[PDB]
Design an enzyme around this catalytic site. Sequence first.
Site, PDB file in Angstrom:
ATOM      1  N   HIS A 174      39.254   5.551 -13.088  1.00  6.09           N
ATOM      2  CA  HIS A 174      38.941   6.442 -14.182  1.00  6.09           C
ATOM      3  C   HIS A 174      37.464   6.498 -14.552  1.00  6.09           C
ATOM      4  O   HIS A 174      36.985   7.525 -15.056  1.00  6.09           O
ATOM      5  CB  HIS A 174      39.731   6.054 -15.414  1.00  6.09           C
ATOM      6  CG  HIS A 174      39.381   6.870 -16.620  1.00  6.09           C
ATOM      7  ND1 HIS A 174      39.921   8.120 -16.856  1.00  6.09           N
ATOM      8  CD2 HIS A 174      38.538   6.619 -17.653  1.00  6.09           C
ATOM      9  CE1 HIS A 174      39.439   8.589 -17.992  1.00  6.09           C
ATOM     10  NE2 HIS A 174      38.595   7.702 -18.493  1.00  6.09           N
ATOM     11  N   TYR A 217      41.290  12.572 -30.779  1.00  3.46           N
ATOM     12  CA  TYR A 217      42.692  12.627 -30.388  1.00  3.46           C
ATOM     13  C   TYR A 217      43.604  13.153 -31.460  1.00  3.46           C
ATOM     14  O   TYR A 217      44.788  13.302 -31.218  1.00  3.46           O
ATOM     15  CB  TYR A 217      43.161  11.255 -30.029  1.00  3.46           C
ATOM     16  CG  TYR A 217      42.717  10.767 -28.659  1.00  3.46           C
ATOM     17  CD1 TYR A 217      43.400  11.150 -27.494  1.00  3.46           C
ATOM     18  CD2 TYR A 217      41.635   9.873 -28.531  1.00  3.46           C
ATOM     19  CE1 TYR A 217      43.017  10.672 -26.252  1.00  3.46           C
ATOM     20  CE2 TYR A 217      41.255   9.385 -27.298  1.00  3.46           C
ATOM     21  CZ  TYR A 217      41.952   9.793 -26.174  1.00  3.46           C
ATOM     22  OH  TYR A 217      41.555   9.307 -24.962  1.00  3.46           O
ATOM     23  N   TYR A 236      49.911   6.330 -24.766  1.00  6.94           N
ATOM     24  CA  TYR A 236      48.782   5.849 -25.563  1.00  6.94           C
ATOM     25  C   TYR A 236      48.171   6.910 -26.531  1.00  6.94           C
ATOM     26  O   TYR A 236      47.620   6.558 -27.584  1.00  6.94           O
ATOM     27  CB  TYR A 236      47.684   5.327 -24.647  1.00  6.94           C
ATOM     28  CG  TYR A 236      46.964   6.471 -24.004  1.00  6.94           C
ATOM     29  CD1 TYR A 236      45.873   7.073 -24.636  1.00  6.94           C
ATOM     30  CD2 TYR A 236      47.407   6.997 -22.797  1.00  6.94           C
ATOM     31  CE1 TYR A 236      45.232   8.150 -24.067  1.00  6.94           C
ATOM     32  CE2 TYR A 236      46.763   8.067 -22.218  1.00  6.94           C
ATOM     33  CZ  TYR A 236      45.683   8.631 -22.858  1.00  6.94           C
ATOM     34  OH  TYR A 236      45.056   9.691 -22.283  1.00  6.94           O
ATOM     35  N   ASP A 296      -0.194   4.764   1.420  1.00  2.00           N
ATOM     36  CA  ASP A 296      -0.379   5.397   2.722  1.00  2.00           C
ATOM     37  C   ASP A 296      -0.056   4.393   3.852  1.00  2.00           C
ATOM     38  O   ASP A 296      -0.695   3.321   3.978  1.00  2.00           O
ATOM     39  CB  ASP A 296      -1.779   5.991   2.862  1.00  2.00           C
ATOM     40  CG  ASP A 296      -1.818   7.190   3.793  1.00  2.00           C
ATOM     41  OD1 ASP A 296      -0.872   8.000   3.738  1.00  2.00           O
ATOM     42  OD2 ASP A 296      -2.804   7.337   4.563  1.00  2.00           O
ATOM     43  N   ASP A 313      -1.345  -1.147   6.382  1.00  2.00           N
ATOM     44  CA  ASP A 313      -1.244  -0.689   7.774  1.00  2.00           C
ATOM     45  C   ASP A 313      -2.587  -0.791   8.521  1.00  2.00           C
ATOM     46  O   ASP A 313      -2.649  -0.551   9.753  1.00  2.00           O
ATOM     47  CB  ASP A 313      -0.642   0.715   7.882  1.00  2.00           C
ATOM     48  CG  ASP A 313      -1.530   1.789   7.263  1.00  2.00           C
ATOM     49  OD1 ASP A 313      -2.287   1.487   6.317  1.00  2.00           O
ATOM     50  OD2 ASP A 313      -1.466   2.952   7.715  1.00  2.00           O
ATOM     51  N   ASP A 370      36.246  13.127 -18.845  1.00  2.00           N
ATOM     52  CA  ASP A 370      37.300  12.704 -19.770  1.00  2.00           C
ATOM     53  C   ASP A 370      37.316  13.648 -20.980  1.00  2.00           C
ATOM     54  O   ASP A 370      37.420  14.867 -20.824  1.00  2.00           O
ATOM     55  CB  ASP A 370      37.018  11.266 -20.174  1.00  2.00           C
ATOM     56  CG  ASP A 370      38.128  10.659 -20.980  1.00  2.00           C
ATOM     57  OD1 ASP A 370      39.171  10.327 -20.372  1.00  2.00           O
ATOM     58  OD2 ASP A 370      37.949  10.506 -22.221  1.00  2.00           O
ATOM     59  N   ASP A 388       0.843  -1.172   0.000  1.00  2.00           N
ATOM     60  CA  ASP A 388       0.000   0.000   0.000  1.00  2.00           C
ATOM     61  C   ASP A 388       0.897   1.247   0.000  1.00  2.00           C
ATOM     62  O   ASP A 388       2.105   1.172   0.290  1.00  2.00           O
ATOM     63  CB  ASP A 388      -0.839  -0.054   1.253  1.00  2.00           C
ATOM     64  CG  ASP A 388      -1.984   0.924   1.249  1.00  2.00           C
ATOM     65  OD1 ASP A 388      -2.346   1.523   0.204  1.00  2.00           O
ATOM     66  OD2 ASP A 388      -2.534   1.081   2.354  1.00  2.00           O
ATOM     67  N   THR A 427      -3.631   0.642  -3.625  1.00  2.00           N
ATOM     68  CA  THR A 427      -3.899   1.811  -2.800  1.00  2.00           C
ATOM     69  C   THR A 427      -5.303   2.427  -2.964  1.00  2.00           C
ATOM     70  O   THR A 427      -5.811   2.534  -4.067  1.00  2.00           O
ATOM     71  CB  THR A 427      -2.883   2.908  -3.154  1.00  2.00           C
ATOM     72  OG1 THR A 427      -3.295   4.153  -2.586  1.00  2.00           O
ATOM     73  CG2 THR A 427      -2.802   3.088  -4.688  1.00  2.00           C
ATOM     74  N   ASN A 428      -5.927   2.846  -1.870  1.00  2.00           N
ATOM     75  CA  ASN A 428      -7.130   3.660  -2.005  1.00  2.00           C
ATOM     76  C   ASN A 428      -6.712   5.135  -2.157  1.00  2.00           C
ATOM     77  O   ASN A 428      -6.132   5.715  -1.253  1.00  2.00           O
ATOM     78  CB  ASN A 428      -8.133   3.453  -0.842  1.00  2.00           C
ATOM     79  CG  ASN A 428      -8.730   2.046  -0.805  1.00  2.00           C
ATOM     80  OD1 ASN A 428      -8.593   1.270  -1.737  1.00  2.00           O
ATOM     81  ND2 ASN A 428      -9.413   1.718   0.282  1.00  2.00           N
TER      82      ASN A 428
HETATM   83  C1  LIG Z   1      41.649  13.152 -23.651  1.00  2.00           C
HETATM   84  C2  LIG Z   1      42.038  13.153 -22.200  1.00  2.00           C
HETATM   85  C3  LIG Z   1      43.448  13.701 -22.172  1.00  2.00           C
HETATM   86  C4  LIG Z   1      41.157  14.112 -21.440  1.00  2.00           C
HETATM   87  O1  LIG Z   1      41.916  11.876 -21.494  1.00  2.00           O
HETATM   88  C5  LIG Z   1      41.982  10.618 -22.092  1.00  2.00           C
HETATM   89  O2  LIG Z   1      42.787  10.245 -22.927  1.00  2.00           O
HETATM   90  N1  LIG Z   1      41.011   9.786 -21.592  1.00  2.00           N
HETATM   91  C6  LIG Z   1      41.048   8.340 -21.419  1.00  2.00           C
HETATM   92  C7  LIG Z   1      40.007   7.642 -22.256  1.00  2.00           C
HETATM   93  N2  LIG Z   1      39.905   6.278 -21.793  1.00  2.00           N
HETATM   94  C8  LIG Z   1      41.062   5.652 -22.231  1.00  2.00           C
HETATM   95  C9  LIG Z   1      40.993   4.422 -22.828  1.00  2.00           C
HETATM   96  C10 LIG Z   1      42.135   3.800 -23.273  1.00  2.00           C
HETATM   97  C11 LIG Z   1      43.357   4.403 -23.120  1.00  2.00           C
HETATM   98  C12 LIG Z   1      43.421   5.633 -22.510  1.00  2.00           C
HETATM   99  C13 LIG Z   1      42.279   6.266 -22.067  1.00  2.00           C
HETATM  100  C14 LIG Z   1      42.384   7.616 -21.422  1.00  2.00           C
HETATM  101 MG   LIG Z   2      -3.556   2.521   4.633  1.00  2.00          MG
END
Ligand SMILES: CC(C)(C)OC(=O)N[C@H]1CNc2ccccc2C1
Ligand SMILES: [Mg+2]
EC number: 3.3.2.10
Lengths: 546, 546
Positions: free
Chosen positions: B523, B465, B382, B10, B184, B334, B8, B122-123
Site C-alpha cells: 500500500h 472518512y 476499518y 572534469d 584524471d 490513497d 574533480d 575543480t578548476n
Molecule cells: C480512502 C480510501 C478508500 C481511498 O483508502 C483508504 O482507506 N486508505 C488507507 C489509508 N491507510 C490505512 C491505514 C489504516 C487502515 C486502513 C488504511 C487504508
Molecule cells: Mg581534470
Amino acid sequence: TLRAAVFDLDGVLALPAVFGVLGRTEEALALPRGLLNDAFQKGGPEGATTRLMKGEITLSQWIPLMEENCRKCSETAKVCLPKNFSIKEIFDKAISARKINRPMLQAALMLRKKGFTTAILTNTWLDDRAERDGLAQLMCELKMHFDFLIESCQVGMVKPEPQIYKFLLDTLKASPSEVVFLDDIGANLKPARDLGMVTILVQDTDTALKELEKVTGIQLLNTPAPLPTSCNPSDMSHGYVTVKPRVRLHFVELGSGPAVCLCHGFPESWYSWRYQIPALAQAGYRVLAMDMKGYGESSAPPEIEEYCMEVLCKEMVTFLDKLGLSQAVFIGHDWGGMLVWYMALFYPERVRAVASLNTPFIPANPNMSPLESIKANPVFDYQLYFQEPGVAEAELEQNLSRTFKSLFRASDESVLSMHKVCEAGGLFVNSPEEPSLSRMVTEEEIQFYVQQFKKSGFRGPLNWYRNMERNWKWACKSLGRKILIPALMVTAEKDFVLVPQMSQHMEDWIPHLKRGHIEDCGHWTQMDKPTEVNQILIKWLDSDAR
Amino acid sequence: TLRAAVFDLDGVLALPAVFGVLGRTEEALALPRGLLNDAFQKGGPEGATTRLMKGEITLSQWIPLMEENCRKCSETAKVCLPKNFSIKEIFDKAISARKINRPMLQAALMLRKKGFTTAILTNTWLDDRAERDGLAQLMCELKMHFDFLIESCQVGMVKPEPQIYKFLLDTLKASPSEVVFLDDIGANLKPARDLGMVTILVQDTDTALKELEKVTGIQLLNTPAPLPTSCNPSDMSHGYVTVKPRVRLHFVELGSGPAVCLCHGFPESWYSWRYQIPALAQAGYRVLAMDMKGYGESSAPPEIEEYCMEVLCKEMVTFLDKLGLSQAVFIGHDWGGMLVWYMALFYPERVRAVASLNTPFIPANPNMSPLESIKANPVFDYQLYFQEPGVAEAELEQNLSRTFKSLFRASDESVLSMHKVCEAGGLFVNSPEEPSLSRMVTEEEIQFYVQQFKKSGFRGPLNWYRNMERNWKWACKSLGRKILIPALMVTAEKDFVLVPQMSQHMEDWIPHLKRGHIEDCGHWTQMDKPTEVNQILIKWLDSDAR
Ligand SMILES: CC(C)(C)OC(=O)N[C@H]1CNc2ccccc2C1
Ligand SMILES: [Mg+2]
Ligand SMILES: CC(C)(C)OC(=O)N[C@H]1CNc2ccccc2C1
Ligand SMILES: [Mg+2]
C-alpha cells in the site's frame, strides 16, 4: 441605498462575447442567419447547452452534441454545412479571442473600493479542451477583483432560472433593491428586475457605465488612471528557506514561468514590490520577492560580517540551490541593486538576467579606499553617520511611524536633507515629529513596515553599510571582468542620492546594457511610479529573459 | 585512517572531459595533433586560460583570447584554420556533451553514507555564455551530494598550485593522510601526493573505483542499486498559504517548470513523497508536495464538514489562486488519490493532468447509499471503525511510534489484518507493542511522522472518512461527465485494500486513461518502490504533461 454590483463575464467583463462568434461565423461562412444560435439553443431547458451550463456534462462531451444539432438545423433549413465545418475550431478561436474589458473591470474595481460587494455571475461550462488553460488564466485574473464568483456549472442552476438569482441574493447577504445587476442579454435581466434589482442592459460598455455611474452616483467613466494591483500580505504565499544554521530567508511567491527574484533596498521589505508582484505574475513570471537578510521575517543575526556582499551573495546562491532553481532573473533596488550587479559578476551561471532601479554599477577603485571615495561626495555623508554601531539604530528605532513617514516621500515632498547629516547629529534633527502622509503611501501601508521592523529593528539593515573595506577587497577581484549577460538599468530623474549621471559610464563594464528612465520619480521608485516601472520591466523581461 | 574523499568534476564526476573534446575536434578536423591543447595552455601561469580558471575573466571574455592563441599556434605550425572555425561552437558542444558519471557519483554517495567528508575540487570558469544554464543545472545536481564544492574561479587559485591543496585541507579540517584525492590529470595529483594524500589517477572509472574500494576498504563497485535521493526536511523550502480565515496550507517546494502538486494519503505527510521530490524536480518540474488539510503544518480545524471532498477541492483551487497558478498537475495517493480524481471532475480547467497511485476512480452509485456499499465489502470494515468520533483517535494517538511502525510495512511484513476491525475492537488489538522496523523506513523517518502528528493528532485526518453521505450527494452531480484530460492510474500488485481489480472499469469514465503497474508493492507505494514510481511518473509527465 445600492450596496452591491453583479457583473456577467461573457459580454460584460470579457469581450467579444462567444455567442457573438456564433453570429460572425454565420456571416463569415455565408450560412443561414441564426443557424448557429438555433443549434446552440436546441431543446431549450432540456437541450445539450443547458446540461453543459449546469455542469451535467463537460465542454468536450458537448462539442459532438452541438455538431449533431448543427447537422439537424442545416437539414431542416435545407442547406449543407461547409466541408471542414468544425465546432471545436470555432470555439477554440472564440474562447481565446475574448479579453478582459478593461473599463468594466475598472468600474468594478472602483465600486469595490468605495464599499460595494461585487460579484461575477455567469453561465459557464466545465472546460476540458486541450486549450482550457486560456480560460483558466482569464478567470484567475478576473476573480481576484471580486467578492464572489458564482458559476452556473458549479452551482447547477443557470440564468434566467429564478433560483440562481435567489442564490445570488443569498450569497450577497443583500436585498434585491441594494443590487445593480449588469448583463448583455435581456432575458437574464427580467428575473433580476422582477425581484426589484436595478438592471443594466449592456450594449456598448461606455453607455452601460453611464447608467451605472448615474444610478450609484459614483464616478466611473473618465476617472483618473488607477494604481496597479497591490498585494494583500495575508493573501500571499509566504516561503521560508534555511540557507545555513543561524539564517533563514523569507519570501513571497506569485505566478509561474521564469523565476524572477526581487531584492528591495534600505530600509524596506518584500512589501516594497507590492505593485510589481501581480503585474509580473500576470506577465508570465514566477515572482520571488525577498525579505533580504536582516529584514522582516528573514533572520537578522547581529554580526556585521554576516552582511558583507560576499556572504550575502553566497547566501542567495544557496537560496536557489535549496529551491531547486538553476537560475533566476535578479532585479534590485538601492542596496538590492548593488547585490544583483555583484551576483552577475561572481555567479553569472545563476543569473538569467540582471536589472537595477536607481543603483548604478560602479567598480571598486583599487587606488582609493572606499571610505575616502565616500567623503569626497557630500550627498553620501549619511553613509558615514551609519558606521558607528548604535548611533543610527537609536534614532531610527526611536519612532518607527515617524521614520517611515519621513523617508518614504515623493520628490516634491521631502523633509530631510541628506546634507551634512553627521554635523547635524542625525537624519531627522531638522524634520517633524508627526510628518504628514506622503501621497505615495496609505496609513495602513506605513504600519505594515512599522510592524515588520518591530521584529529586528535596524541593526541588521544598517550593517549592510558597515563592510565598506571588506566589499572593496572582494570587489577588486572582479576588475578584469565584464557583465555580458542581459542587463537593465533604470534611472530615476529625481533621486537626489542615486542620481542618473552616476550611471553614465556603466556601458564600459556592460557593453550591451539596456536602459529605462523614469521622469519625475524620486528614490522610492516602485511606489512612486509603479505603472512606469511595471511597463519598463515587463518589456525588458519579454525581450531579454524569455 | 582515511576520512575524506575529494573528486574533480572534469574527467572524474562528469564525462567526457572538455580537454578531451580538444583532442576529438583535432582528429575530427584533421588539425595538427595537440594544436588545440597548445592554444588552450598558452602562456601557462600567465596565459588566458589560467586567468579564466582564477576568476580574473569570464568565459565569454576568454573565447576571443583562445581564438588568438589558436590563430598564433596555427601560424607557427604553418597550417590554416578551417573556414568557419569556432571556439564558441566547440565549447558549447563540449560543455553540453558532458554528463554526470553515475558510478562515480554513486561511489561518492556511498562513502558519504559510511561517514566520509566528501568534496568537489575543480578548476572551473565563470560561465556567461547564452547557454550557461546547462552547466548551472549540472552543478546543482552534483553539489547537493557533497559537503563542499571548491571552485578555482571562486577562490582565485588553481590546481596544481600548492595553495589550493592547503585551502582544501583547511576546508576539510582533515590532515593530508586522511584524504583520498581523485583526478584524471597526473600533474594535479603530484601536490596531493607531496603532502601525503592517497591519490587515484582516474583513467577508466571502474579501475579507479577498484583502487578506491581497495584503499578505503568499503564496497563501491557492484554494490546493490541505491535508493533515490531523499529530502532533508530542514533543507526544503516550506510554503504557507491561507485559503480562508481559519485555514492555512503548508507545502514543500522544489524545482522549476510545470507545477506538479503531490497529495499524500491517510495518515501521512508531504514527507511521504521524499523519494519523488528530487527526481521530479530533476526531471524538469516544480514540485509542490502538500500537507493536506488536517495534517502536519496545515491547519486542522475540528469540524467534520471542513473535510468533505467539496470543501477540500474548493480549498485546493484557492491554493492555486493565491499562488498565482492557473493549472497544476495533480498526483495523489490513497485519500489524495480520491481528491485528484474529483479535482479533474469539477475543476478540469485547473488540472493540467491527473494521476493516482492505488486509488481507482469509482463513481457514486446513485442507487446505493455509500455506507451500505461499504458494508458489502469485508476489507473496508476499518472505514466503519473510523465513523465514531473519538474511538479511532484514541487508539491511534495512544502511541504514535507504535502506530506508524504498525502501518508502514511492506507486503511481506504485515502485522494488522484489516479483517473485522470493528469486531476486534481496534486496528492494533492483535499487533505488537514494539513492532520491528519495516525495511522501508529508518528509525529517524518514523520519528518525523511521530513529531508531525503531535501537532494535531488524528481528528482532522480521520474526518476525511466521515462525510460518506455528503461526498456521495456531491459525487452524483458528476455522473454525466467523463474525465478527458490526461490521466494516469498506477496499481500496486500487493495492496490488499486498494486492489488492482478495483481499477478495472475505469476506462468507461476515462476512455484515454494510461496505466502503470508495480509488482510486489503493498500500500505504501512511494516508499515501498520509490525507483519504479519515479520511472512511471517522469515517463508519463514527459509524455502527457509538457
Ligand atoms: C480512502 C480510501 C478508500 C481511498 O483508502 C483508504 O482507506 N486508505 C488507507 C489509508 N491507510 C490505512 C491505514 C489504516 C487502515 C486502513 C488504511 C487504508
Ligand atoms: Mg581534470
Ligand atoms: C547603498 C546605496 C549606496 C546603493 O544607496 C543607499 O544608501 N540607499 C538609500 C537607502 N535609503 C536611504 C534612507 C536614508 C538615508 C539614505 C538612504 C539612501
Ligand atoms: Mg451574456
